[PDB]
Amino acid sequence: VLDSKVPTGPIEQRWDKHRFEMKLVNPANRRKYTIIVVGSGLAGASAAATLGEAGYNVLCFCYQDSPRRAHSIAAQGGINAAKNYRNDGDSIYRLFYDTVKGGDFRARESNVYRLAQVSVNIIDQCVAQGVPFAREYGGLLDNRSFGGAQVARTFYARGQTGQQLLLGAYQALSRQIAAGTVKMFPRTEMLDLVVVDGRARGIITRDMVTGKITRYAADAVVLATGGYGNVFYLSTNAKGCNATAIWRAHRRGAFFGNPCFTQIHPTCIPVSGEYQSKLTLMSESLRNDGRIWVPKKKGDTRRPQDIPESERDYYLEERYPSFGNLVPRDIASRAAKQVCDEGRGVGPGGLGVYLDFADAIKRLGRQKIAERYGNLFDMYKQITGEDPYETPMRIYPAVHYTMGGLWVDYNLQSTIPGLFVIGEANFSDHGANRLGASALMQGLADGYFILPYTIANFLAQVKPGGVSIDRPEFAEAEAEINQRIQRLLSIRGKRTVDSFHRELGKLMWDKCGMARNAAGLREALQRIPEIRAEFWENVNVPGEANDLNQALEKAGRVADFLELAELMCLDALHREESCGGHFREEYQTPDGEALRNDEQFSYVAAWEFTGDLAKPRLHKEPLVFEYVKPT
Amino acid sequence: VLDSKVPTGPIEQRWDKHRFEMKLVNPANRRKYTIIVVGSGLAGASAAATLGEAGYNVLCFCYQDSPRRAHSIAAQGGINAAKNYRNDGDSIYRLFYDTVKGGDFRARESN
Amino acid sequence: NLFDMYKQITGEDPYETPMRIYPAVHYTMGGLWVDYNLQSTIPGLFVIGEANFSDHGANRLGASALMQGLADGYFILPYTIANFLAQVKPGGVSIDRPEFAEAEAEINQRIQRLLSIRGKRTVDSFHRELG
Amino acid sequence: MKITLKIWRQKNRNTPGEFKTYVMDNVNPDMSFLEMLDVLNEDLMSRGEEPVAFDHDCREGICGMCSLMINGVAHGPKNAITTCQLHMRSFKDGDTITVEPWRASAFPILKDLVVDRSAFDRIIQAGGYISVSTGSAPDANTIPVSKVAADRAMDAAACIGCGACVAACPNGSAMLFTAAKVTHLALLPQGQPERYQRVVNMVAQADFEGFGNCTNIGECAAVCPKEISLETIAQLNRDLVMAALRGIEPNTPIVPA
Amino acid sequence: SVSTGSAPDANTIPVSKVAADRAMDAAACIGCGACVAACPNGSAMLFTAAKVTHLALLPQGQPERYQRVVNMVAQADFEGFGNCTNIGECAAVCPKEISLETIAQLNRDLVMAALRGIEPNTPIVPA
Ligand SMILES: Cc1cc2nc3c(=O)[nH]c(=O)nc-3n(C[C@H](O)[C@H](O)[C@H](O)COP(=O)(O)OP(=O)(O)OC[C@H]3O[C@@H](n4cnc5c(N)ncnc54)[C@H](O)[C@@H]3O)c2cc1C
Ligand SMILES: Cc1cc2nc3c(=O)[nH]c(=O)nc-3n(C[C@H](O)[C@H](O)[C@H](O)COP(=O)(O)OP(=O)(O)OC[C@H]3O[C@@H](n4cnc5c(N)ncnc54)[C@H](O)[C@@H]3O)c2cc1C
Ligand code: SF4
Ligand code: SF4
Ligand code: F3S
Ligand code: F3S
Ligand code: FES
């Protein structure tokens, strides 16, 4: 049974009352506890730095060269806070209401309020660390609107806010490392989780440079391994982002909360052939001019600018005319994917649609268009090779973010006692749709102001030490990992790892992608095990275990993705409603929005691994709304 | 009839509750509205400056030579605030009580 | 700065000669009625500063009109005017509508009548009598 | 577009390496360099050889993990871009392209094209931060920062830690990286209380780590992906001179674990 | 250049009593224009110097003072006023007894701004 452990009383004092009620660890005793932190993103680095400042022995891990390589670094948009510096009507309650309504009423209210309440402290801490936020001429901070939000509550660096936030967190982590409190282990990836007597007591890692398999033991384990949006082969996530850690934890007993909840991005640079899997994120501030079109003829060799106005299929205009071409990204991207799927694409392989700017150039002044889109146009010209000022842009949707993940209660603790999941790896509080500039805020909130208290409470309830790395559980986990690696290396089939990953990604994008139906999901669930068996029988990963073998890492990540895809397809088939990112074609209003069902699906679904990949158990955590009412 | 449209509940949260309840204009849409401000005193100049900072098109007027030549430039006394810097018993509630009692009970409490 | 100012204006030194004083009307607490949103009876017409009734009641405390005006300008009017504007469609009214023409004609007729009266008594005589 | 590549191939840190040639017939002009390397790796795996290993995470020129010396110039012939941002439209049919990792004593080579850049991490660990603990921060708008100072601090702070400055510098010096961090932290008021110590510590760490000296050649600023100007080095020199005038002694060096 | 709602607490930045007194002495300018009418060159140097001195003696005016003076000076040259020969009629005519040391403060600020390479912005054209 899932106990959310949410406090009681008025929602404004819930976090303070909980903070008072939780237990504490004396500052002298903090040195007797060891905490393992797997991940060094915004959440991971912030958590490691704060727990090192407290006094605990922290063991931080990351699979990249340095802790400062992580898709927290790539974020372009700003970060939200309820400071109300622009005197426009923003507040903590307004932010809480916005976040709980933007999620389509699929998240707990207490978590959302806590996030909105600690956002202000997040901004204060980030400024105090030397983060170069944009300033006004008088020396005070500057705010901007996130392209549609009703208030200007966003703080930003020029175009790399995520980089500056992660660099502040990384500098704090480096300061702790120099103090001897935090031990950093880059270029090693956690391969398994070891639970001793029902508590997550350690991890089994592989050092990707030398191939060494190492066993670490600790009182508490924190997972900050980011999202799993890379299960689709084409996505805007980094080339190394994966779901190995969370899947291993889920297999160990953690509950997966709404794995089917995914968020996509409307405008991304299309692929240039069947060898690329990374789609570069553009800015949402485009599409303001609209002018999304495609040639009426299926195949035209003429230049895009040579096509007359009467010969252009300006779809999204004769369809959904009431919105004003500013249709929601879900509907626009579904229409674009359908158009490209019909065979009427414009890209190299036929994937992409035209985003024209010529009418905007003529109507407006080129000076202002340059002053608002110069970085984007230069970046597009650098990658694509075509000037947007003359030729139309090409865009294609891609999977961007995952709201789903491991279920956690109010204390950020998963089903397994002692296992804490923060950042993008937990279901947390975005609900069915992630608002802009909210993942950074959520990660920093979890790292800085939330996790220390709850982990201190859990550690105070127990006693330090008692578990070493010679227990039979460690040996069994290590033997399983070694057998898995040896089998992977000994399969030596024909098809490569990327072929299997691409096949899985295309199947997941066509069936469990933007638009989902029962027949398609059933077909995908039928198809997944055949692909998994073909992978486990006919894969070719060359090299040796004790070297720098990248194909082995890719093979492991692909195996975990093949296992996770079945669960997320099952979850998508289960939820017979449309809400947020999750869209079902049988439950849409005629306009094209998501038609919810609040009297039968107003809960959080947690899936339990029962040993069978086709029959996982479903547990429902009901949601009750008291301050914000569904409508 | 006259509707004061004052909020409800405890008097300390009335302004915050009203601020949350009222509608908003997105910063992108502010440039499509024109506001006429007649007067450039303390109230007029402050309102025009704040609405200009917001983004609206403001049209300010005054009958003197310059906006600074308006009245209220001659105000010699100080300006009150409930900051309690001197640590002598002042507060927001004390100021509210003083203002509502000095007016001989002829004004709305919420304002 | 008061004895010196009095000497500058009156010409008599307060240190040796008694001062002379006489009361005069200073402030008006009354004005156009406004609701909580600082909006008058006419929709869309907002009255701030000393021109509205607002919250001074029957007597204005010292150093209160300054903060009243600054409060109305800085921290109150933006929210209420945004609340009013968010419920209406921008634009749609130009200066060629008949209401503008009628108001302009009334103003022109009033000015012409004022100029064409050309009586005997001056404006300040009537103002002094009324006062 | 037929392309011949000469890739450096080294088995491990202790095993010596050598150049090997690979000829590929069809190369899409609009695909990036790293994707061409990926296609080559797939071909090698199909044939039965050991694939080429290189660092890559984001493929957007922000993370700073890309590190390749292409045709003698860091990050490829085009300037102000990283290796992940370089596309094959900048090359010519029948061209020969030489691919190498960075070369420095402080950047040991671990594989064919992968190097160990933990020296930058250790340089950061020795004072390259602001010592403020969580929860003690004041309000955001407490300390005003002029727009010009914030802009210059952001210009210096956009360093992706790629290590191309070390590779381009004839002396193998990390002066541009250290100068950029020092300039970032020294242009804001929050970095004032410990700047004169900070620079000294950081400089000492670089000397301890195995980097060379700066002859003011200026080669680093020509290949820097984020166009860090040479005025950061002047700012570092001013700070170090002023710290020496104050008798600031460097602390103990950060020894690797 | 401070916007509404972003101000910090009043007692955040301390200002010495002497600095505040001099800033108040310079800030009590009623904009009458008698300084222009008394200066034989028709220069607005006392008005500009008074405003610059007011804003330059408080910490809140620090972040943009060296630009500010330059801009203001350029605007006077754009408006048609003459130059200052340090004659001193404006100080003797000024109703608020603004001293000639405001002009010295403006000269110091402009010299320092020129040493830093500050360049005037575009002039403010009348509507
Ligand atoms: C291109 C892009 C743009 C974005 N823009 C925005 C934006 O404008 N606003 C916004 O609010 N959000 C944005 N996001 C989302 C947000 O930035 C991320 O989702 C969020 O930072 C993820 O938090 P995290 O730190 O947990 O993830 P990450 O930063 O990805 O954490 C990954 C960390 O875990 C480690 N790790 C992972 N797996 C393993 C393993 N098996 N073993 C060991 N270590 C492992 C990695 O080494 C790394 O340290 C964007 C995301 C992307 C991809
Ligand atoms: C001598 C004196 C001393 C005072 N001292 C204090 C004090 O110590 N403390 C305190 O709290 N209050 C004091 N007050 C009261 C207060 O300062 C003012 O009376 C006033 O309430 C505040 O300024 P305001 O902007 O509201 O009005 P004003 O500043 O008078 O507004 C007048 C503005 O409206 C414009 N205007 C007027 N009619 C027209 C028109 N027909 N067309 C176009 N524009 C027009 C003018 O051009 C000007 O811009 C004092 C008042 C006086 C007279
Ligand atoms: S200074 Fe430039 S070249 Fe050197 S590491 Fe930083 S971004 Fe790379
Ligand atoms: S004479 Fe004095 S008060 Fe008048 S404008 Fe000149 S400086 Fe200001
Ligand atoms: S180019 Fe090299 S010599 Fe010094 S100034 Fe830069 S590190
Ligand atoms: S008298 Fe005139 S010439 Fe200059 S110093 Fe004063 S403005
Ligand atoms: S992969 Fe990030 S800079 Fe190249």
PDB file of N, CA and C in Angstrom, chain B residues 106, chain C residues 27-34 47-60 68:
ATOM      1  N   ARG B 106     -15.479  57.079   8.627  1.00  0.00           N
ATOM      2  CA  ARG B 106     -16.231  57.455   7.439  1.00  0.00           C
ATOM      3  C   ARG B 106     -15.579  56.915   6.173  1.00  0.00           C
TER       4      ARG B 106
ATOM      5  N   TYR C  27      -7.000  71.080   1.850  1.00  0.00           N
ATOM      6  CA  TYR C  27      -7.113  69.774   1.221  1.00  0.00           C
ATOM      7  C   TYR C  27      -8.584  69.434   1.045  1.00  0.00           C
ATOM      8  N   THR C  28      -8.876  68.529   0.118  1.00  0.00           N
ATOM      9  CA  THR C  28     -10.232  68.033  -0.078  1.00  0.00           C
ATOM     10  C   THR C  28     -10.222  66.516   0.004  1.00  0.00           C
ATOM     11  N   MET C  29     -10.888  65.974   1.023  1.00  0.00           N
ATOM     12  CA  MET C  29     -11.023  64.530   1.140  1.00  0.00           C
ATOM     13  C   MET C  29     -12.040  63.963   0.164  1.00  0.00           C
ATOM     14  N   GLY C  30     -12.981  64.778  -0.301  1.00  0.00           N
ATOM     15  CA  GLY C  30     -14.000  64.321  -1.216  1.00  0.00           C
ATOM     16  C   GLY C  30     -13.499  64.222  -2.638  1.00  0.00           C
ATOM     17  N   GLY C  31     -14.374  63.731  -3.502  1.00  0.00           N
ATOM     18  CA  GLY C  31     -14.022  63.551  -4.897  1.00  0.00           C
ATOM     19  C   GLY C  31     -14.911  62.499  -5.533  1.00  0.00           C
ATOM     20  N   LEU C  32     -14.451  61.998  -6.673  1.00  0.00           N
ATOM     21  CA  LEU C  32     -15.196  60.975  -7.390  1.00  0.00           C
ATOM     22  C   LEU C  32     -15.191  59.666  -6.613  1.00  0.00           C
ATOM     23  N   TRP C  33     -16.358  59.033  -6.531  1.00  0.00           N
ATOM     24  CA  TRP C  33     -16.473  57.761  -5.836  1.00  0.00           C
ATOM     25  C   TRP C  33     -15.821  56.660  -6.658  1.00  0.00           C
ATOM     26  N   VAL C  34     -15.040  55.808  -5.995  1.00  0.00           N
ATOM     27  CA  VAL C  34     -14.402  54.667  -6.634  1.00  0.00           C
ATOM     28  C   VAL C  34     -14.613  53.441  -5.759  1.00  0.00           C
ATOM     29  N   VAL C  47      -9.911  56.678 -11.017  1.00  0.00           N
ATOM     30  CA  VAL C  47      -9.600  57.939 -10.359  1.00  0.00           C
ATOM     31  C   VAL C  47      -8.668  57.640  -9.197  1.00  0.00           C
ATOM     32  N   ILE C  48      -7.464  58.207  -9.234  1.00  0.00           N
ATOM     33  CA  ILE C  48      -6.461  57.981  -8.205  1.00  0.00           C
ATOM     34  C   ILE C  48      -5.967  59.327  -7.695  1.00  0.00           C
ATOM     35  N   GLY C  49      -5.265  59.284  -6.565  1.00  0.00           N
ATOM     36  CA  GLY C  49      -4.717  60.486  -5.972  1.00  0.00           C
ATOM     37  C   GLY C  49      -5.696  61.215  -5.081  1.00  0.00           C
ATOM     38  N   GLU C  50      -5.745  62.538  -5.200  1.00  0.00           N
ATOM     39  CA  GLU C  50      -6.666  63.357  -4.427  1.00  0.00           C
ATOM     40  C   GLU C  50      -8.015  63.533  -5.110  1.00  0.00           C
ATOM     41  N   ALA C  51      -8.152  63.095  -6.358  1.00  0.00           N
ATOM     42  CA  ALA C  51      -9.387  63.309  -7.097  1.00  0.00           C
ATOM     43  C   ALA C  51     -10.482  62.310  -6.747  1.00  0.00           C
ATOM     44  N   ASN C  52     -10.186  61.283  -5.959  1.00  0.00           N
ATOM     45  CA  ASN C  52     -11.178  60.298  -5.557  1.00  0.00           C
ATOM     46  C   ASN C  52     -11.464  60.416  -4.066  1.00  0.00           C
ATOM     47  N   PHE C  53     -12.539  59.753  -3.631  1.00  0.00           N
ATOM     48  CA  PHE C  53     -12.835  59.715  -2.204  1.00  0.00           C
ATOM     49  C   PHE C  53     -11.895  58.772  -1.468  1.00  0.00           C
ATOM     50  N   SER C  54     -11.812  57.523  -1.919  1.00  0.00           N
ATOM     51  CA  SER C  54     -10.842  56.537  -1.429  1.00  0.00           C
ATOM     52  C   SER C  54     -10.975  56.405   0.089  1.00  0.00           C
ATOM     53  N   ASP C  55      -9.905  56.605   0.860  1.00  0.00           N
ATOM     54  CA  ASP C  55      -9.821  56.075   2.213  1.00  0.00           C
ATOM     55  C   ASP C  55      -9.387  57.085   3.267  1.00  0.00           C
ATOM     56  N   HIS C  56      -9.499  58.380   3.006  1.00  0.00           N
ATOM     57  CA  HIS C  56      -9.191  59.344   4.057  1.00  0.00           C
ATOM     58  C   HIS C  56     -10.380  59.654   4.954  1.00  0.00           C
ATOM     59  N   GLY C  57     -11.559  59.117   4.657  1.00  0.00           N
ATOM     60  CA  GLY C  57     -12.741  59.373   5.460  1.00  0.00           C
ATOM     61  C   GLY C  57     -13.058  60.844   5.631  1.00  0.00           C
ATOM     62  N   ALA C  58     -13.342  61.265   6.858  1.00  0.00           N
ATOM     63  CA  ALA C  58     -13.735  62.639   7.127  1.00  0.00           C
ATOM     64  C   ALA C  58     -12.572  63.533   7.524  1.00  0.00           C
ATOM     65  N   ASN C  59     -11.356  63.001   7.587  1.00  0.00           N
ATOM     66  CA  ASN C  59     -10.207  63.793   7.996  1.00  0.00           C
ATOM     67  C   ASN C  59      -8.939  63.083   7.552  1.00  0.00           C
ATOM     68  N   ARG C  60      -8.039  63.831   6.925  1.00  0.00           N
ATOM     69  CA  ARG C  60      -6.804  63.291   6.371  1.00  0.00           C
ATOM     70  C   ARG C  60      -5.695  63.430   7.401  1.00  0.00           C
ATOM     71  N   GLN C  68      -0.755  57.890  -0.013  1.00  0.00           N
ATOM     72  CA  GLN C  68      -1.955  57.459  -0.723  1.00  0.00           C
ATOM     73  C   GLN C  68      -1.752  57.540  -2.230  1.00  0.00           C
TER      74      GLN C  68
END
